[PDB]
Amino acid sequence: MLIRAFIPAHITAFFVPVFHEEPLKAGSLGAGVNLSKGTNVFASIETGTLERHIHVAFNGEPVKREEAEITYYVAEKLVPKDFLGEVEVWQYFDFPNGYGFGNSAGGALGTALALSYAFGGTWLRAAQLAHEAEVKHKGGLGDVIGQLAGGIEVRIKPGGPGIGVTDNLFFEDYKVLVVPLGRLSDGDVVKAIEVEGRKALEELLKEPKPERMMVLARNFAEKTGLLPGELSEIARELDKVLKNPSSMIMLGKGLFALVRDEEAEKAKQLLSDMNLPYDIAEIYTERPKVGRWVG
């Protein structure tokens, strides 16, 4: 009756949105990282009554379907229509919504895996549906497929689970530092992203390396005009303590960086001494977890 799923938070380094009217053919190209910190989804399922009820909650509080539309879209599709009883989905996030961590993808996939497990289905069907729910509601283009890949992911062929190709990079003794400030809140950037994004991808596929990705990221965040002065200034001070250059979480107001244990300390002293908020998450190398909640 109690199923739990964990979906790591996903951060994008640089991207190229490939929009497509066909959900499965819709996606993006780019690179990103997955965190040991993310979303935990719990599916409580009780049979009974003369009715079919689906409730959703965000961090302990019930939410209207209107704020939960993506999760609901996923739930209505997986919970049988002849089914009688109560389905409850409790989601817990390690990050605020709208900060670029892909919580909505976490809720979509987490719900799809937990509910497919309880009512029947497969990994692929769950993933496609969560991808589909993301696309149809403008939730995200590569968080779901990115989360399914784990570790440091690279989307080389646009599309949803099943149709697109992602690759993974090897890395050593790396952790993820994040400075989440807030939500990000033209026609030239749509052009710039198209051109810089694809360029970054090509470069990364030339040199498959986490170090290179961060450099290619920083250049991307800057040559597109996406990087705000307020962040750029924080970056200039951050980069002075790290071997690898920090960069902008893609479509949030924050920065992230791949760091080593020792640097991390310095980065803390520095950041905290700037009244700036910071989190440290391990790179989640595994795949999304799903299973009967037994502890």
Q: Which chain residues interact with ligand ATP by CB under 6 A?
A: 97-105, 134, 139-140, 143, 183-185, 251-252
Note whether 44 and 88 are within 8 A (CB). Answer: yes
- Residue 53: enclosing H or E segment and its boundaries? strand 52-58
Interface with a second copy (CB under 8 A), residue from 21, 51, 188, 273: 21
Region of residue 285 (phi > 0: left; psi between -120 and 50: alpha; otherwise: beta): alpha
Please state the closest distance from residue 104 (CB atom) to ligand ATP, in A. Answer: 3
- Of the pair 183, 199, the CB lying nearest ligand ATP is at 183
Contact map string, positions 141 to 180, toward Na ion, x by CB under 5 A: ----------xx---------------x------------
**Is residue 186 near a second copy by the rule CB under 8 A?**
no
Q: Are strands 85-92 and 52-58 parallel, antiparallel or unpaired?
A: parallel
Query: Near Ca ion by CB under 5 A, which window of 15-23, 28-36, 69-77, 80-88?
Result: 15-23
Residues 23-62: x/- map of binding to a second copy (CB under 8 A)?
x---------------------------------------
92 binds Ca ion (CB under 5 A): yes
- The residue range among 1-9, 19-27, 56-64, 264-272 that interacts with Na ion, by the rule CB under 5 A, is 1-9
**∠ Cα 203 285 142 (to 5°):** 55
Instruction: Find out whether 155 and 31 touch, Cβ atoms under 8 Å.
Output: yes
> At closest approach, how far in Å is the CB of 240 from Na ion?
27
Q: Indicate which single residue of 27, 32, 102, 142 sits in contact with Na ion (rule: CB under 5 A).
A: 102
178: β partners: 256, 279
Q: Does 288 bind Na ion (CB under 5 A)?
A: no
What do you get for the CA distance between the two ends of the chain, in Å?
Answer: 14
Question: Which of ligand ATP, Ca ion, Na ion, none sits in contact with 251, Cβ below 5 to 8 A by type?
Answer: ligand ATP
What is the C-alpha separation between 251 and 247, in angstroms, rounded?
12
Contact between 13 and 30 (Cβ < 8 Å):
yes
116 counts as binding Na ion under rule CB under 5 A: no
DSSP state string for 135-180: HHTT--SSHHHHHHH-SEEEEEE--STTT-EEEE----S-EEEEEE
Distance CA 278, CA 270 (A): 11
Which tokens hold the place of 178? Answer: 């994040």
CB atoms within 10 A of CB 274: 13
Considering only residues 219 to 278 of the shown chain, the ones binding Na ion according to CB under 5 A are none
> If contact means CB under 5 to 8 A according to the sort of partner, which of Na ion, Ca ion, ligand ATP, none does residue 134 touch?
ligand ATP
Q: Report the distance separating Cα 274 and Cα 222, nearest Å.
A: 23
Tell me which of a second copy, Ca ion, ligand ATP, none is bound by residue 105, counting a contact when its beta carbon lies within the kind-specific cut-off of 5 to 8 angstroms: ligand ATP
21 contact, one of Ca ion, Na ion, ligand ATP, none, CB 5-8 Å limit per kind: Ca ion
Interactions with a second copy, residue window 115-144 (CB under 8 A): none
Per CB under 5 A, 21 contacts Ca ion = yes
Q: Taking Cα atoms as reference points, which of 147, 116, 164 lies closest to residue 284?
A: 147
Residue 92 interacts with, from Na ion, Ca ion, ligand ATP, none (CB under 5-8 Å by kind): Ca ion
Give the interface with Ca ion as residue ranges (CB under 5 A): 21, 92, 94, 261
Give the interface with a second copy as residue ranges (CB under 8 A): 21-23
